[PDB]
Ligand binder design. Structure first.
Ligand SMILES: [O-][O-]
Ligand SMILES: [Fe+3]
Ligand SMILES: [Fe+3]
Ligand SMILES: [Fe+3]
Ligand SMILES: [Fe+3]
Lengths: 199, 198
């Protein structure tokens, strides 16, 4: 398969989420820094767990390097804007999606790779949603991250097909799409980069 | 920052080289795993010392280089039909981690000094092997020397942000003695940082 990001996601970022993000951009930016690092950390955990899946290892090693660069780019921007390293707790999103990962191998891996495609897919969509509302410096940076995010999305789907069956993958995608949109549109008590709508 | 030769207490023993040369498949696979654990350890430090800006910047870059090394070893493996055979971790790194004190900032000091030692030893050990390997592999290993030397220097420079000059020197004295004992003591497995046979 491997479709366009707009067709993969079940909904766009709500306007109510954007309004919350614009009114607390510093929290956003720090969380973002954190997301880029978690993505690298998760990538390395996949390599340790699936330590005989050669294509996954090579892809995850590269993805982690790329995510670290993102991490460093956000830090460089935080510095330029005088944004300190203050603690911001992990949002609910990723753990929410991981509750959908099946129990047994080899389908557990497939679901794990699909969730990664959704996280990347969502990030790309949300960066795109924000760009028009941000200042030039931050908007230009976010716009540049879109293409990496799409590349990461495609990478997870390609791994999925490599280790999974066409129809199983299509069903998984359908089920993760529903749970993801619920995490995105449901109320949330905090503002994170992948939070729901703050109430 | 002293030269790597002055930093280590001993060179790599002959019996280790002879064993390494006789099982280059285990050598390569374990080396690949060390590059991976070097990256993993760097991200772990970042998570742990997440407000130390110089530290996170240095470890972020270091992790990225280790992941290139990992990818490099894997490509060499594929070319030579060396499979992804699971290989258990050796004792060296956990042996050195026992030296780490429990309270900050000396915990971090000890941690960084240990990092410098691992890197310095890898640099010395690649060097000791180079003249005995096939051309391609030997030149690849020579090329990693410069990199490990920079990692060694980074760890040690960073350690100087957390302990005065005499305290870091004392830390280094103690870690050197321990590292040498790990390198020269009998070991049953062959691993990149394993000891000697029997
Ligand atoms: O950030 O993925
Ligand atoms: Fe990223
Ligand atoms: Fe990504
Ligand atoms: Fe390395
Ligand atoms: Fe290194």
């Amino acid at each position: 398969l491997i479709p366009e990001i707009d067709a993969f996601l079940g909904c766009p970022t709500p306007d109510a989420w954007i309004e919350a993000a614009l009114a607390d951009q510093e929290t956003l930016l720090i969380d973002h820094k954190n997301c880029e690092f978690k993505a690298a950390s998760t990538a390395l955990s996949l390599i340790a767990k699936y330590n005989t899946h050669l294509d996954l290892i090579n892809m995850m090693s590269r993805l982690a390097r790329e995510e670290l660069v993102h991490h460093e780019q956000v830090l460089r921007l935080m510095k330029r804007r005088g944004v300190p390293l203050r603690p911001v707790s992990a949002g609910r999103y990723a753990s929410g999606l991981r509750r959908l990962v099946r129990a047994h191998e080899p389908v557990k891996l497939v679901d794990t790779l699909v969730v990664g495609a959704f996280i990347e897919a969502r990030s790309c969509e949300r960066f795109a949603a924000l760009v028009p509302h941000l200042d030039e410096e931050l908007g230009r940076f976010y716009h540049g991250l879109l293409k990496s995010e799409a590349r990461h999305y495609q990478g997870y789907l390609k791994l999925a097909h490599n280790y999974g069956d066409e129809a199983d993958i299509a069903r998984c995608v359908e089920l993760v799409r529903a749970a993801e949109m619920e995490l995105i549109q449901s109320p949330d008590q905090e503002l994170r980069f992948h939070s729901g709508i703050p109430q």
